[PDB]
Design a protein around this ligand. Structure first.
Ligand code: CA
Ligand code: CA
Ligand code: CA
Ligand code: CA
Ligand code: CA
Length: 579
């Protein structure tokens, strides 16, 4: 079982334009009959143009997933079921996603753009649906969500164009249930099924946007043409909780966003509902008249502020303006619906599509999972990716520093030294950094490019004694990561420093004044190595036979001209594959 209080990692996206959107078409959960069954039936529809690389993934609401004993469906053109297998994550924890091969010839669901339907789908449960969903909250506000997509099993990513979502209809969805129960006679066999997808697009407007794309698959070659008086209407429902974040709502003709595709401004009422019609609906919706191609409809929600502000609603901040992580939401689902009606308000058969936007802040740092993956490149499952003690959102928003660049470190030097040597933690997405040595009055006295491993060697003049700043400058952030170090009287012997060492490193890099000899010992004072720092540098290398075990603690002292320095700050060897 999936235990209480567990959360699922979201998946990144990959592109593969050969996969059309999949459409999960379940039975409704809105009757005593349906509620007294232990089966939720479904069909699965898709369009396809070899191998087991690409999988079909079905992800079910936890209320449902907790009770699932078996999921199966007949491949297209067959009457023999194939069974879905419950996925496990990057370790051995169960997810709420069930998986089956895509291609029927590879024991999958589709095949022998063509249209295929896998029929007789059955979600089998260990109790009745009614007993299961009677242990839920307000199903008007928290829906029973579903999502379907093709997963690239080589990359563990979602094929962007395959994704579809929605929610099961219950008695709580009374307006949509009444629509399903009052189907129009007009073009009653035109459409086979409909589903939606809701995504975030940073390129919409100035704050990004939400795209709500509905697909309506055809049974044949439907052609829309009505008199002015018999024109249909398009109807849409926008989750009321998004309304504080929406600047405008637009209809686009319809995967990339392009403002040139705008065909109307849309209005919504106080609960997020709207309707649009026309003297010729062909001007607003591309019905692909007399072609078999799926009808697409796009609704665009232009945000009025960063998408990262939604789950942080009601968030509190400390004295220094940093997010109190306990005050933000870790996830939030928003639901949407769209459908066509005839001129009397009756539902055009099979044109009702729902969708779910599943926003997540897995690590409660204020940056949505998908924002971290697509924009900042910070880790979506670590609230402090670089380890510097400033959390990712705070860094992007408050400090305006890179969340991929930790705190620089530089050993003290003397007035006779000509190089400031040190290092800084750089995380996998970090840009190319520039290190600067700046005196107390704000004058830059040296600059260099930080190497990819974080080390740097900044050339400086023989410089006046005092407190200096080592600043690490990213091109993507306004502010540098800073630390201070000392340039001391040249009769002094400052403590050296040790660069970070992991259990894959055969060498220990040390920094210290030129001509001093630096000796490194572990917690048991075993001399692991000694090196004299050369005449025109302030860093040197120690070589060891075998790398050090993760957890061993390192210190160092330097000696020169009869002086012995204080001990360096300790350095702990880390695991070479821990981020
Ligand atoms: Ca739910
Ligand atoms: Ca986050
Ligand atoms: Ca993070
Ligand atoms: Ca940080
Ligand atoms: Ca940082």
């Amino acid at each position: 079982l999936v235990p209480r209080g567990s959360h699922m990692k979201s998946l990144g996206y990959t592109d593969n334009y050969t996969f059309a959107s999949m459409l999960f078409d379940p039975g409704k959960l809105d009757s005593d009959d349906a509620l007294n069954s232990n089966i939720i039936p479904f069909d699965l529809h898709s369009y396809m143009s070899s191998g087991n690389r690409y999988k079909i993934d079905l992800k079910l609401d936890p209320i449902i997933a907790e009770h699932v004993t078996k999921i199966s469906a007949n491949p297209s053109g067959s009457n023999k079921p194939v069974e879905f297998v419950r996925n496990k994550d990057e370790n051995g924890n169960l997810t709420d996603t069930w998986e089956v091969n895509f291609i029927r010839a590879n024991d999958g669901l589709f095949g022998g753009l063509s249209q295929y339907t896998a029929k007789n789908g059955k979600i089998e449960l260990d109790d009745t649906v009614g007993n299961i969903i009677s242990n839920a909250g307000n199903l008007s506000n928290n829906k029973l969500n579903h999502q379907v997509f093709v997963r690239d099993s080589r990359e563990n990513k979602i094929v962007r164009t395959s994704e579809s979502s929605g929610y099961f209809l219950t008695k709580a969805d009374d307006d949509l249930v009444n629509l399903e129960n009052n189907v129009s006679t007009e073009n009653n066999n035109a459409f086979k099924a409909s589903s939606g997808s809701a995504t975030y697009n940073e390129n919409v407007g100035e704050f990004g946007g939400i795209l709500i794309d509905q697909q309506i698959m055809k049974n044949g070659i439907f052609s829309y043409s009505k008199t002015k008086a018999n024109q249909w209407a398009y109807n849409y429902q926008i989750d009321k909780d998004l309304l504080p974040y929406i600047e405008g709502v637009e209809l686009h003709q319809y995967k990339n966003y392009d403002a040139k595709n705008k065909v109307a401004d849309l209005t919504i009422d106080e609960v997020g509902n709207g309707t649009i019609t026309s003297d010729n609906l062909n001007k607003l919706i591309e019905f692909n008249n007399a072609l078999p191609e799926t009808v697409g409809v796009r609704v665009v929600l232009k945000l009025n502020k960063s998408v990262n502000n939604i789950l942080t609603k009601d968030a509190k901040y400390d004295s220094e303006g940093n997010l109190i992580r306990e005050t933000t939401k870790q996830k939030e689902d928003f639901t949407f619906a769209g459908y066509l009606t005839d001129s009397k308000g009756a539902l055009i058969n099979n044109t009702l599509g729902t969708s779910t936007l599943a926003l997540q802040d897995y690590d409660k740092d204020g940056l949505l999972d998908r924002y971290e993956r697509q924009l900042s490149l910070s880790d979506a499952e670590n609230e402090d990716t670089d380890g510097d003690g400033k959390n990712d959102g705070d860094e992007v928003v408050n400090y305006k520093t890179s969340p991929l660049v930790g705190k620089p470190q530089a050993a003290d030097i003397t007035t006779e030294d000509t190089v400031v040597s040190g290092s800084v933690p750089l995380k996998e997405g970090a840009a190319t950094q520039t290190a600067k040595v700046i005196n107390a009055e704000g004058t830059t006295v040296g600059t260099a490019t930080v190497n990819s491993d974080g080390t740097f060697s900044v050339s400086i003049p023989n410089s006046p004694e005092g407190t200096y700043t080592i600043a690490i400058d990213s091109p993507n952030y306004d502010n540098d990561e800073v630390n201070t170090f000392e340039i001391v009287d040249n009769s002094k012997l400052p403590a050296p420093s040790i660069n970070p060492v992991d259990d894959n490193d055969q060498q220990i890099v040390v920094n210290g004044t030129s001509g001093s000899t630096v000796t490194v010992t572990d917690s048991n004072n075993n001399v692991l190595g000694t090196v004299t720092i050369p005449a025109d540098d302030t860093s040197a290398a120690i070589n060891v036979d075998t790398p050090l075990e993760a957890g061993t603690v390192l210190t160092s002292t330097a000696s020169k001209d009869g002086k012995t320095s204080d001990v360096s700050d300790q350095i702990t060897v880390t695991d070479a594959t821990a981020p």
